[PDB]
């Protein structure tokens, strides 16, 4: 059917930049939004911003604006995340989720309907 796979686990020192990929297959990914969320071990879920894979326009939440860069590659069907200036509080697992439908006539970006999720990438900071 359809799958959202990610890269392997990675460990970085405080002061580096981490790259997490998300590959979507089995469906036309250029017609759906893509949301990325964070989960600290033992805590709840924190929401980082979304990416629209048609025009490349991105939004980011509070407490993240300035140290996250969200790009895309249409030809190889991957979604990228560039989080620089890592700290000790960023040890978590990162998910990529498929949001609403890109509809060209209304703003369906903020609709919280994440159907299909990635298996997660374990990023820890020591």
């Amino acid at each position: 059917q359809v799958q959202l796979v990610q890269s392997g686990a990675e460990v970085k020192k405080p002061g580096a930049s981490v790259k997490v990929s998300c590959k979507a297959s089995g469906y036309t990914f250029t017609g759906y939004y893509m949301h990325w969320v964070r989960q600290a071990p033992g805590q709840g879920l924190e929401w980082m911003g979304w990416i629209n894979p048609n025009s490349g326009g991105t939004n980011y939440a509070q407490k993240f604006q300035g140290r996250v860069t969200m790009t895309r590659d249409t030809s190889i069907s991957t979604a990228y995340m560039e989080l620089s200036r890592l700290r000790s509080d960023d040890t978590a697992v990162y998910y990529c989720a498929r949001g609403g439908w890109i509809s060209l006539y209304y703003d369906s970006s903020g609709y919280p309907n994440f159907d299909y999720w990635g298996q997660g990438t374990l990023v820890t900071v020591s």
Partner: protein, 110 residues
């Protein structure tokens, strides 16, 4: 601008209904009707429960229903079994195209 309010944990006997409720700011939940529910297994990716404040997706049986009353959104679980061991989350549209998430309720069976 903080997270949505949610209790620590809930419990109930099998065959007994349980209610999990979230109370939020009127700019987040009381204005827009975009609320979704999210359980997860420990060590697994979460799965989508309820689309809007009350809607059923495909592949989910008719044991979960939702409702909204002012600033409060609640989820009703009917027929509690041993497969209800999960961690439930609230999330909603929060304005300016930002989505916020709740704390988390862990349910235990008896």
């Amino acid at each position: 601008q903080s997270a949505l309010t949610q209790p620590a944990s809930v419990s109930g006997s099998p065959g007994q209904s349980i209610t999990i409720s979230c109370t939020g700011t009127s700019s987040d939940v009381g204005s827009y009707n975009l609320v979704s529910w999210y359980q997860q297994h420990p060590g697994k990716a979460p799965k989508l429960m309820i689309y809007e404040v009350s809607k059923r997706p495909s592949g989910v049986s008719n044991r979960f229903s939702g409702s909204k009353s002012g600033n409060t959104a609640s989820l009703t679980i009917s027929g509690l079994q041993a497969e209800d061991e999960a961690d439930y989350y609230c999330c909603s549209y929060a304005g300016s195209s930002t989505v916020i998430f709740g704390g988390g309720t862990k349910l235990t069976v008896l």
